Design a protein around this ligand. Sequence first.
Ligand SMILES: Nc1nc2c(ncn2[C@@H]2O[C@H](COP(=O)(O)OP(=O)(O)OP(=O)(O)O)[C@@H](O)[C@H]2O)c(=O)[nH]1
Ligand SMILES: [Mg+2]
Lengths: 64, 276, 100, 488, 130, 182
Amino acid sequence: SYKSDQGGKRLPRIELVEIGPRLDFKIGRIHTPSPDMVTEAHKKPKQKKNVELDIMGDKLGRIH
Amino acid sequence: VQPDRRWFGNTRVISQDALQHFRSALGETQKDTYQVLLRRNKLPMSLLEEKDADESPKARILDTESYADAFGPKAQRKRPRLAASNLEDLVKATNEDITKYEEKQVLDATLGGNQEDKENGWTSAAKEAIFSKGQSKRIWNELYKVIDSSDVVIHVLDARDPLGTRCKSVEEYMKKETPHKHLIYVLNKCDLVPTWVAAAWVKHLSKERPTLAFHASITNSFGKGSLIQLLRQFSQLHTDRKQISVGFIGYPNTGKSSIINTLRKKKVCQVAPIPG
Amino acid sequence: KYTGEGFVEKFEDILKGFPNINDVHPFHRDLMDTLYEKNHYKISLAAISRAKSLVEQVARDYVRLLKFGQSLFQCKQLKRAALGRMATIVKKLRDPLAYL
Amino acid sequence: STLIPPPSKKQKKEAQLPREVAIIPKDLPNVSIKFQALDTGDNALRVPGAISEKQLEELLNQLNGTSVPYTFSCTIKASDPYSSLIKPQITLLYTPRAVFKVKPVTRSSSAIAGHGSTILCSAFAPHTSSRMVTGAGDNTARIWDCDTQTPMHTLKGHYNWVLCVSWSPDGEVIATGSMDNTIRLWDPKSGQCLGDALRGHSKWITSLSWEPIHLVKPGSKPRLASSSKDGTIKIWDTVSRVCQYTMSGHTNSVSCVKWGGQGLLYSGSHDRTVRVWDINSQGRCINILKSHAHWVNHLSLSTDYALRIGAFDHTGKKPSTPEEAQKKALENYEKICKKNGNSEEMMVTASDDYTMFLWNPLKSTKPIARMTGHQKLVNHVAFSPDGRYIVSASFDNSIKLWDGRDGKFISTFRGHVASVYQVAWSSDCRLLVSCSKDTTLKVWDVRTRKLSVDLPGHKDEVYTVDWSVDGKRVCSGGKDKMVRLWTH
Amino acid sequence: EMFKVIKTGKSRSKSWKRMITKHTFVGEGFTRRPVKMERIIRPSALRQKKANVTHPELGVTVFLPILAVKKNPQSPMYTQLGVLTKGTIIEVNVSELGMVTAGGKVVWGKYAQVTNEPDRDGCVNAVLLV
Amino acid sequence: LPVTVEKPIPVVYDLGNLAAFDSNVLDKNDLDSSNARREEKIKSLTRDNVQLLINQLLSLPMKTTTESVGGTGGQSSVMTLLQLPDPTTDLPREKPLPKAKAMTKWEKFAAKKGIKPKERAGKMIYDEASGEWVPKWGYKGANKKLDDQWLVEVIDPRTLNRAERKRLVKKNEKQQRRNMKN
RNA sequence: GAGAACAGAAAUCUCCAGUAGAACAAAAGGGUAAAAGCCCCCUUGAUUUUGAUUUUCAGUGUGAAUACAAACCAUGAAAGU
Ligand SMILES: Nc1nc2c(ncn2[C@@H]2O[C@H](COP(=O)(O)OP(=O)(O)OP(=O)(O)O)[C@@H](O)[C@H]2O)c(=O)[nH]1
Ligand SMILES: [Mg+2]
């Protein structure tokens, strides 16, 4: 961190230092998934119109 | 009843900072003339009360000088409280009390005649009984029945003078005891007023209640299908409820019986030009 | 019912009785406070209208409760309870009555 | 438990947007600025860029040529002190800091065992916060080494409830008011019954106050004020331990007593009446006050926190000579005495007519302000330690805040659930502790009008809390027979 | 008992309906159901919403509102029905007392068991389980 | 000592996973392997990436509780922590979603005859003689009172009571399998 | 394995050791060692409370189950579990 005084009370100045480990990867080959597997690995657990909670609960009903 | 560790439990425990989150939250509850509460979210509402009152009601004067000390045979009381200050002050402050007294003798003498008939020695007639009706024990036993029976209340009003028909009085009971109930106004008999007149009314009535305009007749009506569109939303919003009532409140001779007929597009209620 | 009016009609004889110190005449209005403490005066009679209105309230409830009674024993216990809550009001009322 | 209603599916998408770096970019408009000291003075019309206040402090500190840092306030309707400049020429309202920070109390030490009865009162020494005496429901009193949290001189000798105690503000003597009639004086180092008990009141002791440091002659111990439930007030000697006089002024029990600043005495009593008493007329009544309609509880004075500490700062450095102490207590009082260049100490009365009255008893007999607003009766009222803010504690589970100047309402520290028993201030005039009938203590920033941190931990009701003069530690006393030291 | 069998029809000969004869906690959003649909009756007068609640210690009786009915003996039904006989365990708003947990998270709900027979007097009197 | 850094391409933020995505042109020979002037080309870009990240991070709302001693599952009052949004980048889920549902052949019978489920109150029955409670199973169960009491009132009978439960215990175990099949 | 009278192939007691042929709830590629083994100490469990799946004839601001999470609870000086 650095209290940098132009961001004022809030924003600091960030000056990094290397810690590493300094590394360089070379790509070989790749196996890929089946698209049917991709859909399975991207799925939500799945867990209302004119109906709103206010602050304090308060299930409301909009009329229109 | 068995013994148990619960019952000796702590049940409905608050979290702390949500209180200040809720004491904040009473300000920003902006109402909608297009929305209705359905569930309430049980909260310890009395802890969320106490707006900034600035009057601090009166000290209990019985604490210092009770009764027997104040007056009687015992009466340990000699000088007045607070025994006001000065003579010219006392001369002053009574002099308007002179005037303010006779002002109401001038003013209420306009209100009477109610003393002259005593010296004339004659009294007025009785109240006619038909002005009582109603105001009857059964006739309000109707009313709390249907209010407790119905889910959404509508409230009809004469277009000729809705202010003479608003009859607040119940809305009072609606807000305080049945918060989930609905109370929409309905303006029927719109064909007796000029066109712009009823137009001006709903603008003075949409600010608080949804207030449909309407004209009831089986064969030549107005504004039915707005109400038919209106009701089913309540049946839509009360999805779980398997069915829903709606009762029609109002003065006598307003079209409560009439409106249902022109909903059902036939004669189902009995109707009459007489009131009851 | 008949018990309930008896408390009321006596109190209505009291609350009609006393000349209701303010807006009488500013001579008399001040002069009675010098005798009777316009503070202690009003609060006593205001207590009685508070006392009266509770009795009509107690009366109308226990009347309304009573129509669902099913036995002799149940309804009898309601009557004693009805008059006792009337009696608790009047026992409470001891000190302002001796004043008046 | 109850829960906050959750954010919406709509609202979850709102936070996903990148947003709102407070760049204060150039930030180049230029609007003129006016300074104003909050006591009397308005001083000129200058226009810099939109800047931070540390520059603004060093802008004002060269204007007088101080080398004294200040607090800045502005937009006063609605009282909202570039930080202000986003809200919309501009009048800056400045006021000194008395530069010191007291850290908010969060945790505790252990709970301390001791006497097997309830706790009635407690007080810190002004010269150090490691020593703190407690008043118990037992017949005895207790002094605590607050560093070790251990007993130092279990203090026997009274034979009824030790109700109210006080510390001699130089740091020599401890008064112990008891429920029978008796007052014993004490030494902290020895813990010995210093002579015979001061006897002569006929009912129990209500409140004890010391004669302040800056009035007692160098080479003399300060005397003591004593108020008791029989309505008598006796001004005792410590040296000969014989009182100088009773005063038969009030009719009922005398609630509380304070020594004045201009050598005066102040007495709230249960006669719905406050009397003004003077030592130099050999204990003679000079002014009687008639405003309240129900009887008076816990009067206080503006400069009392200065009058309590007796020539110590927050560091608690001990002065050498009694004349230096005569200077230092005079110094510290004068820093709070003449805000407007005027020796006008202020007094507020509190009573069960749900009402407080603001008083300048030397200048007039008319009350300045009628503070109003509580629903249940007020109990405990004390000024700010700079003599600038007045707080009010009451039984309606609420703590209201007032001005010290005109008696204007500020806000209400809502959040207490049971009846608030008594409050106490932090030294740097920021924090505010309060004990209530419920178990918790609640600490309140006066600046942000908000609960800092609720602290539970006791087992039962709390009767007594007190704040340490250095702003370091907090003692607590209640029914559950344990002493709890609270700190940062 | 506790059900006065309400005969219906012009010839009142169909009865099939029951009226709960005793005092009752109802709920809040009650709104009486259709009459052709109803079988059980909890009439309006026998609907108690605020109890008169005492405390064993501290000697205070506070008039409190009623939240729910957990355990009624002498059925499993009447728990669902909210039937206030003697011995029923109910749930009370404790907002006014101000119980504080360790944690400082003040409690506004306790189980109180009723004491009286609220048939035989109009008020409900109930002891906080401590 | 200046703070705010611009870039040619608006860098996409994913704060839920604490992420930063520069999409600008990567010059090749600045990133030469044998280039000595490399680490500064690495670092200066990186610290300008990081500096912009925290500026969005410090542009967030935060929590301030007022709790204290023995904060069991929360922050202190002096703690003030960053309210984060959701991780918007959709990562591969490790395991498929577990929906192992059946009608179990009881719920079918619960569907036809509308037997509502019971209260699930407690284990304790009330005993007569003695007046104690002595719960139903688990210790001194009401089941195994017959095998432990001391008379019969008309080959041992008590082991038969053990046997018939071992039918009915294993009848759970037999009805366990067929709903595990279907 | 080397030891100690009664006491022997087997009773208990000492020292050396078994990477453990510790028993491991499992069955296993593997590993737990101041243990997931052995012993001792302290204690409930089928708690409450609302948004997802259900079922209701007083459709019953849920009435309950069930799903989730939160408060709690147990122990430990604590981290924690
Ligand atoms: N002009 C006009 N008159 C109407 C309208 N609807 C009803 N009326 C008249 O109002 C009178 C009252 O109709 P009702 O249905 O009997 O009124 P009601 O209040 O429902 O009758 P009760 O409920 O028994 O008091 C009828 O005789 C109609 O003549 C309307 O839409 N326009
Ligand atoms: Mg009509």
